């Protein structure tokens, strides 16, 4: 997809005015620089490949990271799935109002030894389990209970030292597009909850160790990476100016439009 | 000449002697729902003359240092004739609008407005943890005003109405990406927009969800010499187009 | 028993790759697509619309709507300067936050010509002419009308047609320019001067204002996507 090349021009004196227009009509001008001056015939070989949608969004970015301790009670992590807990992916998705994409979820799991007290600590390789629960199903509440038996829930196992795990998830929604904004309540009496958090129901994500409590505590940490594929976008939007403050809504504090210079003529 | 239009709809007619062109949506005219995208299981009701007409909202006064107004369109017509009666008895419904903002002045005044029509405008509350209530977001056929100073955080449930952030967090200058027209009092007298139905679901409820918002922001403020008439009003006139409803129930 | 050999680059996680991956939900049936109006096929459909430029910062108008209005009075002498700013659409604080500049701050290189639309939002009887110059670099910023008329300019008269389009051409030694600030690939200066005065009849307010839009022409292109510096985060939300 190349761009338009500039044709030659000649000096004119006529009744045709390409420069003088009216911008009250909500119509930006289609003026080419070969209309207000004298140009030469140049050929453009540049391309708009990197400014397409799929080359703009299909890049991996972290969304959340949680820790959990091996030799403990309540050592297992959980996370409701939403893309509004970071500041560099959330700003990119709020350029469009409605989106539609697949994913390629990728986890990077690290580990770190805790200050144990016993001597001659030798640990084997650790094993981790990432369980995905669709919205509505039973949730586990302890590290060892029998709800971790994933009778139907898809879940991956992973030992340390290998390549990071990766799975792909298709477009799981009720409506035809992920609505990034929702101006309206959730109940017909117009009370209580207002805004985007009435559409967010995409399921949770449970993580835990598989090995037992051998001789020394281990505190792990898992980071999650999104990657949208086959993206379509509708209804573009001005980009966010003020900083984010909350996850569930768009509350902000007012700030100036730009930073300031000293006068109107100083370059 | 390219300065006269005559829009007729139902039993009403809007004529103008000095106006710009007609900005139509994102390049698409409002049409009915086809059978490829339909999801309801039953027959829709198309009144098509009792609703598709020009309703006129309430006037607002353009003072010398004003800030702006907004209307939250799909329930501004909640009490307006037979459009406000089919909205209560039905469960679903899709529409497309035809906004026509008009404001006239002499050849000695000056000023400039910006008439946008944004879809899915989430507003921000004054307090950080709270969210604005229903009464402060939309008025029944009456404009809510912006404020040239900022709203304090000590208020519980109030819309943050600083004009230079437009209530949504974006810069106010970047609002021109939406369909929009300028009412410049030098050359223009009215602005027209034709908006199609923009939503992710083919039919939506009308009482819980306001999928459009019409904002009017004065960029160059109204100024006149002493002696001229100081009272300049602004009137908005909305007309739905190709409306159909579904799912009959009791009144609510 | 096919003999293979793993090359370097195995078992790494490159954040910008393109591979296949096994699905977690087999035989899922997605929701069918719908013709929602206004589909963006490319990011350069966004940066060809107008956006009002805050040319009037001056540290008192940045927290107001006063920043977009350029003041124009009726003088007593000729050749005064209306405004002036260098043309760096990714680093200069004037063009930093418009819709054009907010896409260039995601990329690194850019190339093409830039339009500049003005609109005289004054009275109906006021008249005057303006000069809209553009000086490629190498010299300083022009100081007078006599020095600024040498570059690329256009003389604009206000009438029934209110608007005017100065189209800054693409004059550069390289095929691209940096978004961030650089001495080596500077682009020049944009100035504007009174050609004649602004005459008004009696009982008319004297000071008229001017808006100024910006957009890109149909040969604009970007390259080398990066992250943006206009956002900041310390903890999660």
């Amino acid at each position: 997809a190349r761009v338009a090349d500039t044709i030659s021009s000649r000096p004119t004196n006529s009744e045709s005015i390409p420069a003088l227009t009216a911008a009250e009509t909500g119509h930006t001008s289609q003026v080419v620089p070969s209309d207000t001056m004298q140009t030469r015939h140049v050929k453009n070989y540049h391309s708009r490949s990197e400014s397409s949608i799929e080359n703009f969004l299909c890049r991996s970015a972290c969304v959340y990271y949680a820790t959990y301790t091996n030799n403990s009670k309540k050592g297992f992590a959980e996370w409701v799935i939403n893309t509004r807990q970071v500041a560099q992916l959330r700003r990119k998705l709020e350029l469009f109002t409605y989106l539609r994409f697949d994913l390629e979820l990728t986890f990077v799991i690290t580990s770190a030894q805790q200050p144990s007290t016993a001597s001659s600590v030798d640990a084997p390789v650790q094993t981790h389990q990432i369980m995905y629960v669709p919205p509505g199903g039973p949730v586990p509440t302890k590290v060892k209970d029998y709800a971790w038996q994933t009778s139907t829930n898809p879940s991956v196992f992973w030992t340390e030292g290998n390549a990071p795990p990766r799975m792909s998830i298709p477009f799981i929604s009720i409506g035809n597009a992920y609505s990034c904004f929702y101006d309206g309540w959730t109940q017909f009496s117009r009370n209580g909850v207002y805004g985007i958090n009435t559409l967010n129901n995409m399921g949770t994500l449970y993580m835990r160790h598989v090995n037992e409590a051998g001789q020394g505590p281990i505190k792990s940490t898992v980071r999650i990476y999104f990657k949208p594929k086959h993206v379509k976008a509708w209804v573009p939007r001005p980009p966010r100016l003020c900083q984010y403050e909350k996850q569930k809504n768009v509350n902000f504090s007012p700030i100036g439009v730009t930073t300031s210079r000293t006068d109107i003529i100083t370059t | 000449s390219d300065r006269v239009r005559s829009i007729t709809l139902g039993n009403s007619t809007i004529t103008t002697q000095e106006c710009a062109n007609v900005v139509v949506g994102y390049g698409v005219w409002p049409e009915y729902l086809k059978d490829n995208e339909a999801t309801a299981e039953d027959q829709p009701t198309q009144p098509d003359v009792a609703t598709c007409r020009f309703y006129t909202l309430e006037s607002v006064q353009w003072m010398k240092n004003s800030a702006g107004w907004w209307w939250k369109l799909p329930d501004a017509l909640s009490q307006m004739g037979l459009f406000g009666q089919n909205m209560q008895y039905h469960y679903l419904g899709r529409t497309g609008y035809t906004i026509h903002v008009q404001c006239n002045a002499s050849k000695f005044h000056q000023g400039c407005l910006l008439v946008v029509c944004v879809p899915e405008a989430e507003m921000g509350c004054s307090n950080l943890n709270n969210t604005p209530e229903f009464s402060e977001l939309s008025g029944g056929d009456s404009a809510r005003m912006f404020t040239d100073t900022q709203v304090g955080e000590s208020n519980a449930k109030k819309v943050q109405t600083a004009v230079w952030n437009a209530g949504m967090g974006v810069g106010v200058g970047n609002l021109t990406i939406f369909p929009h027209q300028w009412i410049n009092l030098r050359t223009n007298n009215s602005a027209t927009l034709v908006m199609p139905y923009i939503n992710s679901v083919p039919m939506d409820n009308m009482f819980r969800h306001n999928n459009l918002t019409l904002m009017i922001i004065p960029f160059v403020p109204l100024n006149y010499s002493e002696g001229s008439s100081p009272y300049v009003p602004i009137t908005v006139t909305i007309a739905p187009m190709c409306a159909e409803y579904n799912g009959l129930r009791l009144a609510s | 028993g096919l003999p293979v050999m793993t090359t370097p680059g195995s078992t790494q996680f490159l954040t910008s790759d393109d591979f296949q991956s096994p699905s977690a939900m087999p035989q899922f049936d997605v929701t069918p697509e719908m013709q929602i109006p206004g589909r963006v096929n490319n990011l350069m459909e966004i940066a060809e619309v107008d956006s009002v430029v805050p040319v009037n910062n001056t540290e008192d108008n940045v927290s107001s709507l006063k920043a977009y209005q350029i003041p124009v009075q009726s003088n007593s002498d000729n050749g005064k300067q209306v405004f002036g700013f260098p043309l760096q659409p990714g680093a200069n604080n004037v063009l930093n936050r418009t819709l054009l500049g907010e896409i260039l701050n995601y990329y690194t290189h850019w190339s093409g010509s830039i339009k500049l639309t003005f609109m005289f939002c004054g009275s109906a009887m006021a008249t005057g002419k303006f000069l809209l110059a553009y000086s490629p670099p190498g010299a300083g910023v022009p100081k007078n009308r006599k020095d600024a008329m040498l570059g690329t300019h256009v003389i604009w008269d206000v009438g029934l047609q209110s608007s005017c389009v100065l189209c800054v051409p693409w004059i550069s030694q390289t095929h691209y320019r940096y978004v961030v600030e650089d001495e080596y690939t500077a682009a020049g200066y944009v100035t504007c001067w009174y050609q004649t005065n602004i005459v008004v009849p009696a009982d008319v307010q004297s000071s008229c204002d001017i808006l100024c839009f910006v957009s890109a022409c149909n040969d604009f292109s970007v390259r080398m996507l990066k992250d943006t510096p206009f956002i900041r985060q310390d903890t999660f939300y």
Partner: antibody
Amino acid sequence: EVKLVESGGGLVQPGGSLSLSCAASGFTFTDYYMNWVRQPSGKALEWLGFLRNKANGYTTEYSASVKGRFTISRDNSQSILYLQMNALRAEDSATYYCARSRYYGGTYRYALDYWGQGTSVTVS
Amino acid sequence: NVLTQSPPIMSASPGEKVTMTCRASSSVSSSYLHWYQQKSGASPKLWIYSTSNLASGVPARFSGSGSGTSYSLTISSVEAEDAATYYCQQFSGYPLTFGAGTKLELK
């Protein structure tokens, strides 16, 4: 010229109510922000709240310590300003001013240019 | 947010160069800083607005400056009429706060 006088002060018992009034003359009352600033005996100033003009909808903006107990309002007929006091304590004894403000550029800086002569309110 | 003025009590002979400071805790904009003047037992009065602009009725000896979190007010020569108290006002968020006050003593 700008002239603001006020009256209504005096000794009022703790827990009581009180109504102050600030009268304005010499300018159009519906175009200027009107503030309420109090000051204790020989101490620093303290701002209580203001009331916007007709162009912004006559909303009020109180401080953090006086919300729920105080109330600013104006009358529609003539140029007169009110201040409703409720649930007074011992530390509400001060000198109460009534200041005006205006737009300096095209914008609104937050200075208070013309001040009232100062009425006294004490409690016991 | 809180303002700190320093020093609180200052003496001044006629003819000397005199300056007082007004230091904020957090950063304020330069357009929202003002300076007031209150004499002995009278109403206050606006003296400097937006940290560099002289108000109405003020002589041309007064001149303020500063940026960020440090600001100053400089008088060229001390007279017998400008012996009073000076406050500084800021606004970054609600509420508007005032300084402690700088008391100027004639000598």
